[PDB]
Design an enzyme around this catalytic site. Structure first.
Site, PDB file in Angstrom:
ATOM      1  N   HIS A  89      42.425  43.131  37.921  1.00 54.48           N
ATOM      2  CA  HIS A  89      42.517  41.670  38.132  1.00 54.48           C
ATOM      3  C   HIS A  89      41.563  40.987  37.164  1.00 54.48           C
ATOM      4  O   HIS A  89      40.416  41.429  36.977  1.00 54.48           O
ATOM      5  CB  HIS A  89      42.236  41.257  39.595  1.00 54.48           C
ATOM      6  CG  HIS A  89      43.340  41.619  40.529  1.00 54.48           C
ATOM      7  ND1 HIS A  89      43.635  40.878  41.652  1.00 54.48           N
ATOM      8  CD2 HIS A  89      44.221  42.663  40.516  1.00 54.48           C
ATOM      9  CE1 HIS A  89      44.657  41.435  42.288  1.00 54.48           C
ATOM     10  NE2 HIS A  89      45.035  42.519  41.619  1.00 54.48           N
ATOM     11  N   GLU A  91      39.612  38.425  37.000  1.00 54.99           N
ATOM     12  CA  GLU A  91      38.259  38.015  37.375  1.00 54.99           C
ATOM     13  C   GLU A  91      37.313  39.201  37.473  1.00 54.99           C
ATOM     14  O   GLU A  91      36.161  39.094  37.071  1.00 54.99           O
ATOM     15  CB  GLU A  91      38.246  37.116  38.619  1.00 54.99           C
ATOM     16  CG  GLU A  91      39.022  37.612  39.808  1.00 54.99           C
ATOM     17  CD  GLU A  91      40.509  37.226  39.814  1.00 54.99           C
ATOM     18  OE1 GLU A  91      41.241  37.681  38.911  1.00 54.99           O
ATOM     19  OE2 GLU A  91      40.973  36.541  40.793  1.00 54.99           O
ATOM     20  N   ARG A  96      32.946  42.756  34.426  1.00 55.53           N
ATOM     21  CA  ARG A  96      32.557  44.003  33.762  1.00 55.53           C
ATOM     22  C   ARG A  96      32.207  43.696  32.296  1.00 55.53           C
ATOM     23  O   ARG A  96      31.264  44.255  31.747  1.00 55.53           O
ATOM     24  CB  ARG A  96      33.680  45.036  33.866  1.00 55.53           C
ATOM     25  CG  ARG A  96      34.089  45.408  35.313  1.00 55.53           C
ATOM     26  CD  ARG A  96      35.117  46.535  35.339  1.00 55.53           C
ATOM     27  NE  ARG A  96      34.529  47.851  35.018  1.00 55.53           N
ATOM     28  CZ  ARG A  96      33.968  48.647  35.937  1.00 55.53           C
ATOM     29  NH1 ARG A  96      33.877  48.266  37.221  1.00 55.53           N
ATOM     30  NH2 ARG A  96      33.522  49.838  35.600  1.00 55.53           N
TER      31      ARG A  96
END
Ligand SMILES: O=P(O)(O)O[C@H]1[C@H](OP(=O)(O)O)[C@@H](OP(=O)(O)O)[C@H](OP(=O)(O)O)[C@@H](OP(=O)(O)O)[C@H]1OP(=O)(O)O
Ligand SMILES: [Zn+2]
Length: 378
Positions: A89, A91, A96
Site C-alpha cells: 500500500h 502509504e 519505508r
C-alpha cells in the site's frame, strides 16, 4: 466534516496552505519521476508521499519520498531472509522510503563536520540523536487510508488486509495468531490496515524499532488526504480511538497531527488497480518498481525497502556510532529479530499500544509469523 482538524501539538504552517503545497509537491515529483506521467509506471490508483519542512517557510519544503500501490504479498511468497516486501500500500511504502532518508541523514551527521552541517539530526543530551528544531514530516495520501478511516464494522475497530481480497475485514473477536506453516498451507495472510499502521506510528513513531536505537521517536506533523477526507472519522482512526493509552516510555506520546483535505480533491477512478508499487527516496536516480504479489521486482530482485536492505543500512550506521552514544545497548548485532528487541523502550511503547487497542475494545494487533525476522546479514 471537510474542515481541517488542528494538531493538538505544534502547527507552524497555515493548514490549508500546507495541505495544498504538500499534495502539489508530491504529485509534481511523481510526474518528474515518471517522465511527465508518461511511463507505464505512472499508472496508479493511490499516490502517497512524505514532504519535509524546516521552519516556517513553506517554500523550503522538500519531497522525501513518493510511492504508489494498493496490494500486499501472496502468503506463499513470504521470505524468511527479509527479501520480500509484505505490504505495498502506497502509504506504507512511503514510510519505508522515509527510513532510507533517515539512515542517509544519520550518515551525514556521522561522516564528517562538513556533511554534518547538512544533517537534519543533532546530538541529544539524553543520548543518541534527535531532530533539529522545527524539522517536520508530512504524510500525503491521495485517498483515505484503508481500514477504520475508509470503511465509514465498529467505529475504531482494528481491520486487516487479507491476501487476494479487496478492502479490509474486521479483526476477529478472539485474537488471531498467524503461523508460517499455516499460511504456507493456505491460511490467507492478514496484514494490519493502513489506518491501524498510521495510528501505530502516532504512538511508536514513524522511525521503527531499529532506528530508535540511534534516534528519539519521530512523528508525522500532518496527514493530508487528496480525497475522501472526513475529519471526525479520520481523527478517530488516526489517534482518538486510543486516547486510553497509558504508561508510555520516555519521549513517546500519542501524536495528534494536523489532519486536512486538499482544495481540489481527487475523484474515484475506474480501472483495475495496478499489481505493482513504485517507490523513490530523495537522492535516488529513479523509481524502483515492485510486484506487490511477490514483494520483489519484476526480475525477482530484492527491493531497497526490504527488511534485509534496511538492516544493511542499519548495520552500516551501527559500525559508525560510538557505543556510548547509542540510545540502547547492542554490542554484537546478529539476528534481525534480536536487534529489534534491543530497542527496549520502543518495544515497551508497542506493548502499551497493543494493550490500548485491546482495552478500548478494538481487538488485538495481528502480527506476522516470527520467522520473517529470523535472519542475519552474510
Ligand atoms: O513497513 P511495514 O510493512 O508496516 O513493516 C512493519 C515493520 O517491519 P520491518 O521494518 O521489519 O519490515 C515493523 O517493525 P518495527 O520497526 O515496528 O519494529 C513490524 O513490527 P515488529 O517490530 O513487531 O516486527 C511489522 O510486523 P508485524 O506484521 O509483525 O506487525 C511490519 O509490518 P508488516 O509485517 O505488515 O510488514
Ligand atoms: Zn491501505
Amino acid at each position: 466534516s471537510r474542515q481541517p482538524i488542528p494538531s493538538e501539538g505544534l502547527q507552524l504552517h497555515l493548514p490549508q496552505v500546507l495541505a495544498d503545497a504538500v499534495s502539489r509537491l508530491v504529485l509534481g515529483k511523481f510526474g518528474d519521476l515518471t517522465d511527465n506521467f508518461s511511463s507505464p509506471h505512472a499508472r496508479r490508483k493511490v499516490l502517497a508521499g512524505v514532504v519535509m519542512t524546516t521552519g516556517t517557510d513553506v517554500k523550503d519544503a522538500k519531497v522525501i519520498s513518493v510511492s504508489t500501490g494498493t496490494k500486499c504479498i501472496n502468503g506463499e511468497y513470504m521470505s524468511d531472509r527479509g527479501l520480500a516486501l509484505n505490504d505495498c500500500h502506497a502509504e506504507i511504502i512511503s514510510r519505508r522510503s522515509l527510513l532510507r532518508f533517515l539512515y542517509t541523514q544519520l550518515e551525514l551527521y556521522l561522516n564528517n563536520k562538513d556533511d554534518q552541517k547538512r544533517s537534519i539530526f543533532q546530538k541529544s543530551e539524553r543520548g543518541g540523536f534527535r531532530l533539529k528544531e522545527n524539522v517536520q514530516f508530512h504524510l500525503y495520501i491521495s485517498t483515505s487510508p484503508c481500514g477504520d478511516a475508509r470503511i465509514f464494522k465498529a467505529r475504531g475497530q482494528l481491520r486487516t488486509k487479507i491476501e487476494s481480497g479487496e478492502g479490509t475485514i474486521p479483526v476477529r473477536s478472539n485474537a488471531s495468531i498467524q503461523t508460517w506453516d499455516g499460511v504456507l498451507q493456505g491460511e490467507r495472510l492478514l496484514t494490519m490496515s493502513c489506518s491501524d499502521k498510521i495510528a501505530r506510528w502516532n504512538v511508536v513513531g514513524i522511525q521503527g524499532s531499529l532506528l530508535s536505537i540511534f534516534v528519539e521517536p519521530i512523528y508525522f506533523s500532518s496527514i493530508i488526504l487528496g480525497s475522501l477526507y472526513h475529519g471526525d472519522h479520520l481523527s478517530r482512526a488516526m489517534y482518538q480511538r486510543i486516547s486510553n493509552i497509558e504508561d508510555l516510555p520516555p519521549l513517546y506520546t500519542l501524536n495528534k497531527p494536523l489532519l486536512s483535505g486538499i482544495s481540489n480533491a481527487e475523484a474515484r477512478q475506474p480501472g483495475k488497480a495496478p499489481n505493482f508499487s513504485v517507490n523513490w527516496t530523495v537522492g535516488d536516480s529513479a523509481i524502483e518498481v515492485i510486484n506487490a504479489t511477490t514483494g520483489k521486482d519484476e526480475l525477482g530482485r530484492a527491493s531497497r525497502l526490504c527488511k534485509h536492505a534496511l538492516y544493511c543500512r542499519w548495520m552500516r550506521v551501527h559500525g559508525k556510532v560510538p557505543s556510548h552514544l547509542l540510545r540502547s545497548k547492542i554490542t554484537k548485532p546478529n539476528v534481525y529479530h534480536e536487534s529489534k528487541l534491543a530497542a527496549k523502550e520502543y518495544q515497551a511503547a508497542k506493548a502499551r499500544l497493543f494493550t490500548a487497542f485491546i482495552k478500548a475494545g478494538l481487538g488485538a494487533w495481528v502480527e506476522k509469523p516470527t520467522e520473517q525476522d529470523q535472519f542475519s546479514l552474510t
